[PDB]
């Protein structure tokens, strides 16, 4: 009965939905290539763009994202740290939304 070794293509029915139901719980394998459940944290493919297009087309995530492309700029300057996190501006602000400067 087990002619196919379940390890990669052992996906679930929920993975063949439209929209895919795995957005609310994956029951497939880590060998899946479905864009619907191929996200991490919860980002659009727009956020995976280069350059990122969240602040160009539509930002889905929050300032919690380590992506300095769609996050809010910090108030620090070249050599002047404000929040005290250790950044000197948006360029070096790889922090979360915990910055009071946001
Ligand atoms: Cd899927
Ligand atoms: Cd899935
Ligand atoms: Cd799958
Ligand atoms: Cd993101
Ligand atoms: Cd982004
Ligand atoms: Cd974004
Ligand atoms: Cd700051
Ligand atoms: Cd700072
Ligand atoms: Cd920061």
Overview of this protein structure:
The PDB classes it as metal transport. Keywords: NMR metallothionein metal cluster, metal transport. It forms a monomeric assembly. The entry is titled "NMR structure of the Littorina littorea metallothionein, a snail MT folding into three distinct domains". The protein: domain-swapped metallothionein from Littorina Littorea. The chain has 102 residues and is largely without helices or strands. The chain has two domains: 8-38, no CATH class; 43-92, no CATH class. It has no helix or strand. It is elongated and about 65 Å long. Bound molecules: cadmium ion (9 copies). One cadmium ion is lined by residues 74-76, 82-83, 87, 99, 101.
Please sum up the structure shown.
The protein has no helix or strand. With 102 residues, the chain is mostly loops. It is elongated and about 65 Å long.
Map the helices and strands.
Layout: no helix or strand
Residues 11, 15, 28, 32, 34 line the site of one cadmium ion (CD).
PDB class: metal transport
Keywords: NMR metallothionein metal cluster, metal transport
Assembly: monomeric
């Amino acid at each position: 009965g087990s002619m196919s070794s379940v390890f990669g293509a052992g996906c679930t029915d929920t993975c063949k939905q439209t929209p895919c139901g795995c957005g609310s719980g994956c029951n497939c394998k880590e060998d899946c290539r479905c864009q619907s459940c191929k996200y991490g944290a919860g980002c659009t493919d727009v956020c995976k763009q280069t350059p990122c297009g969240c602040a160009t087309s539509g930002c889905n995530c929050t300032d919690d994202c380590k992506c300095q492309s769609c996050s809010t700029a910090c108030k620090c300057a070249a050599g002047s740290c404000k929040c005290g996190k250790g950044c000197t501006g948006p360029d070096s602000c790889k922090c979360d939304r915990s910055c009071s400067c946001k």
